[PDB]
Amino acid sequence: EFNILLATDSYKVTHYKQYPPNTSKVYSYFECREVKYEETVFYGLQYILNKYLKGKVVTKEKIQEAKDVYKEHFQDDVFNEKGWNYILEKYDGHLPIEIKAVPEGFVIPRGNVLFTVENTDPECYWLTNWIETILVQSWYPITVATNSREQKKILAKYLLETSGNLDGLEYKLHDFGYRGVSSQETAGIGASAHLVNFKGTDTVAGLALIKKYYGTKDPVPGYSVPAAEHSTITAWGKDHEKDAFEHIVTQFSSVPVSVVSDSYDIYNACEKIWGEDLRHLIVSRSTQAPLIIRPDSGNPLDTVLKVLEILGKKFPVTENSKGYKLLPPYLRVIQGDGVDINTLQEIVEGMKQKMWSIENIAFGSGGGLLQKLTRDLLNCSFKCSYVVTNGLGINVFKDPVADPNKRSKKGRLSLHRTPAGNFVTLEEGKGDLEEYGQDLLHTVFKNGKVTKSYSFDEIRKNAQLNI
Amino acid sequence: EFNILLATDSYKVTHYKQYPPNTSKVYSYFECREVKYEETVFYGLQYILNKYLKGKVVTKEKIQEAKDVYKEHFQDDVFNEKGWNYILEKYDGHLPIEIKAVPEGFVIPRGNVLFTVENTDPECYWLTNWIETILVQSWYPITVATNSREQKKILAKYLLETSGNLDGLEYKLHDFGYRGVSSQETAGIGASAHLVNFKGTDTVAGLALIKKYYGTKDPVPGYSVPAAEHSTITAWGKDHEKDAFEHIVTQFSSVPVSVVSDSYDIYNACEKIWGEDLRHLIVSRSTQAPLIIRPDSGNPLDTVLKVLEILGKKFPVTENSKGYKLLPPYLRVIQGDGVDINTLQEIVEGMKQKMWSIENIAFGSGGGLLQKLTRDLLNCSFKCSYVVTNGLGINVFKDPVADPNKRSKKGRLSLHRTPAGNFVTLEEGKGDLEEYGQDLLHTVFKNGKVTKSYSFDEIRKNAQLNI
Ligand SMILES: NC(=O)c1ccc[n+]([C@@H]2O[C@H](COP(=O)(O)O)[C@@H](O)[C@H]2O)c1
Ligand SMILES: NC(=O)c1ccc[n+]([C@@H]2O[C@H](COP(=O)(O)O)[C@@H](O)[C@H]2O)c1
Ligand SMILES: [Mg+2]
Ligand SMILES: [Mg+2]
Ligand SMILES: [Mg+2]
Ligand SMILES: [Mg+2]
């Protein structure tokens, strides 16, 4: 059983003794610190609110467990047993906190307030930043969703140029990252963030998370197809690669099937096995059931270009209405090795330069999609901007001399539309002047209850590309 | 609840139709592919065995749930209901799998077998690689534990050179990574891996994981100290930083206390506030209860060196028996911003060149320690090396033409010590010739039971530095 009293940074256990005496309010906010990378997708807070913060999260047993752990961990009694007991007794263990947030799926530039946190009881001034640690982990679904959407922008640009439309876009970047993330929980969170933008995934854990915490009208939010791995090819023995291919495509004769083709020599597999020995099993397939050839090694760009040149000389190629080469509809390629946002851009640009339509290719990405990301990418940060001490509110901030980029915002914050329709964050309570219309943040959590929520279908609509 | 039938890569759902007919055994192994590092710490498999693989993991409801999800996810009935129901009925839902592994905490060069997996019932040839995805996530605790031990080696070298001993080494690298990892589950796994090498942590989640899955004779495996954050300084107001510092060191007058000092001007704080205004509260403190000044911004090397120069001109400095400068015992520094293995090395080398002992400094590291790591760092990989088809064993492997570094090992594997005391992995069942002493792999899981377990104390002993 998760215990929120044990789900903070150790030093926060000692902070209730450090704030100014007679502090009744601590007010804090989360942002992606401003370096015009540009526009982030806000996603993932609703998971945290429901799984970890709502309802009766304090019990007498959890207080005693934490007391006993911290006594040994600090070799001292610093733990605030009385403060936690107050929440248990006064509010039946429900947190006296209010969180306001931008709607999930919203696409918003860096440097803006995304959510704010404050205590609703003066006795609980210390609780606001107790829960910093758990809320800051929202950096991860934000960053996965944002980086996935930035890859969708690249794919959309090159698909539109080379084909004239966006058909199939939502299946062009497939999540391969289940083995390459750091835990089962991370797999579900990260896969769900990718599914904000795309529909193809092998990280099954994302499906149940979406169903439980967000919801979709469709039975499931993402889809897959049968596909080989090296064990199912190499198990046949090195002299029997053709037999493995023949068996697999015949077992999956009326659905799309991906077949990894590089166990021994990708180029021989394409030109001689697929292109000659088994060609009669490929040209017979349906447009709804292509063979998808999967290289999985070598320089990603060089390998894709050579595979395409090989297949173009063994299969009938057409020229689409934009002038780009197109494999027949029963044959496609997926590159799933070494894919991240940089190599994805390299490959589609290299294909365009060689006059190959992006219709021909799809991508799989594991670590690059779900693991090779840190809180530094969008520079996600949670800071106190306002306190009330001795009944007087003061605007507070940090401004380190050697790094102006760690300067934080001052006072009570609100998010507004500008006259040109862009976003602005107002500081120092200036939203109250109503010169910029109403605050766009909404109360999503108050006093142990989730007060506003979004379906996964809503989030996908909010996160759409402009195109 | 967790459902192992939904905890695999989607394509593995389809692999039972792809292996050669008449296959009764699939045998697979895990390694860190050869060389770039040398030596890895094997850690974290026992967590996975106990949390996810042992006991009754198949039920009628879980089979039906997976059947329903996969029907929608694939738009097709491909799920192996018969094969999963076989495990349910014959084995009461216990997995007929045997896993053999090197003892946890063992320090092993790259390119060696670390564990193997095989099915114990011919009907379950498909189950070996079903569980690849969950087992390969062991890359994360292995990589955290290894990267943390490599930092410990750097610290030990420089501490020995500048002071003559290793006193305090185990508290020199403190885990700050709770907010910077991707999930609660990752936090506990990663923090527990760092504690293989060190004893200081703020990532509380690691403590409960170790207690539940490994065990220590001590009450807790890691420890912390009171410390400020920017909210507990800046809440006092920009003009009252000195009041915040004075309150905090007085509240924690008899334990070590870390006080972040860079809210507005780290160099003013050190020279004028600590070095003059509050100096009388510092020079009175015990050797067991120093003030630890914490910069948190700017260039990490330049900032540490300038802080040390400032403090050495305001406080009495000694020269130790190695010739290096030493602050008084009541005053220390912790650098917890921008710390990874590369900047840690930069800082201790820069200190040595300026004749400062590493006794003066400690480090905190969050993302660099627990999040900025991928499966590519040690190149962790799980592959099939042996199968039995029509009662004949065959040695199988991949060997892609464009990347010899993706070549996998052949046949039945074993791990041995060499005559010179190093390690060798024997292939093709050659361990059976018994020219090389006992196999170092031990059965840790068989038919749903954990058969061999290690305490956290044993793991720490196995992972000790040579020195
Ligand atoms: N359906 C699939 O083909 C599938 C699914 C999951 C992982 N994979 C593997 O994932 C690897 C890529 O992972 P990384 O992006 O983490 O390096 C590929 O080499 C690929 O073989 C493939
Ligand atoms: N006890 C502490 O001082 C403590 C604990 C946890 C995090 N932190 C913060 O962790 C940050 C470092 O995080 P990253 O290494 O992920 O960038 C520091 O800037 C530091 O303020 C400090
Ligand atoms: Mg692969
Ligand atoms: Mg790989
Ligand atoms: Mg900081
Ligand atoms: Mg930071």
mmCIF file of C-alpha atoms and ligand atoms in Angstrom, chain A residues 9 11 375-376 406, chain B residues 174 176 179-180 202 227-228 230 258 294 296 336-339 365-368, ligand 2:
data_model
loop_
_atom_site.group_PDB
_atom_site.id
_atom_site.type_symbol
_atom_site.label_atom_id
_atom_site.label_comp_id
_atom_site.label_asym_id
_atom_site.label_seq_id
_atom_site.Cartn_x
_atom_site.Cartn_y
_atom_site.Cartn_z
ATOM 1 C CA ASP A 9 12.083 13.924 -0.647
ATOM 2 C CA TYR A 11 14.493 16.880 3.459
ATOM 3 C CA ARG A 375 13.382 16.818 -16.607
ATOM 4 C CA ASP A 376 16.036 19.102 -18.188
ATOM 5 C CA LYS A 406 16.528 29.845 -12.671
ATOM 6 C CA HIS B 174 23.546 11.633 -2.129
ATOM 7 C CA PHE B 176 18.404 13.738 -5.062
ATOM 8 C CA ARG B 179 11.323 14.271 -8.498
ATOM 9 C CA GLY B 180 13.461 13.727 -11.601
ATOM 10 C CA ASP B 202 16.489 11.572 -0.078
ATOM 11 C CA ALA B 227 18.200 20.498 4.683
ATOM 12 C CA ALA B 228 16.582 23.663 3.363
ATOM 13 C CA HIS B 230 14.441 27.504 -1.858
ATOM 14 C CA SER B 258 22.417 21.651 4.764
ATOM 15 C CA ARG B 294 24.783 24.200 -0.637
ATOM 16 C CA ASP B 296 22.653 25.193 -6.445
ATOM 17 C CA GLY B 336 23.837 19.203 -5.802
ATOM 18 C CA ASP B 337 23.262 20.945 -9.138
ATOM 19 C CA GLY B 338 24.369 19.597 -12.522
ATOM 20 C CA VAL B 339 26.076 16.516 -11.054
ATOM 21 C CA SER B 365 22.706 14.019 -7.919
ATOM 22 C CA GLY B 366 19.165 13.432 -9.166
ATOM 23 C CA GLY B 367 18.582 13.004 -12.877
ATOM 24 C CA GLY B 368 22.236 12.225 -13.552
HETATM 25 N N1 LIG C 2 18.224 17.434 0.308
HETATM 26 C C1 LIG C 2 18.334 18.294 -0.825
HETATM 27 O O1 LIG C 2 19.032 19.264 -0.765
HETATM 28 C C2 LIG C 2 17.591 17.943 -2.127
HETATM 29 C C3 LIG C 2 16.815 16.817 -2.222
HETATM 30 C C4 LIG C 2 16.195 16.539 -3.403
HETATM 31 C C5 LIG C 2 16.379 17.381 -4.491
HETATM 32 N N2 LIG C 2 17.137 18.498 -4.388
HETATM 33 C C6 LIG C 2 17.247 19.250 -5.611
HETATM 34 O O2 LIG C 2 17.578 18.396 -6.568
HETATM 35 C C7 LIG C 2 18.108 19.218 -7.704
HETATM 36 C C8 LIG C 2 18.961 18.476 -8.539
HETATM 37 O O3 LIG C 2 18.177 17.661 -9.368
HETATM 38 P P1 LIG C 2 18.771 17.060 -10.760
HETATM 39 O O4 LIG C 2 20.080 16.350 -10.482
HETATM 40 O O5 LIG C 2 17.732 16.070 -11.216
HETATM 41 O O6 LIG C 2 18.952 18.146 -11.797
HETATM 42 C C9 LIG C 2 18.941 20.307 -6.900
HETATM 43 O O7 LIG C 2 18.842 21.595 -7.647
HETATM 44 C C10 LIG C 2 18.474 20.355 -5.712
HETATM 45 O O8 LIG C 2 17.893 21.671 -5.342
HETATM 46 C C11 LIG C 2 17.770 18.772 -3.218
#
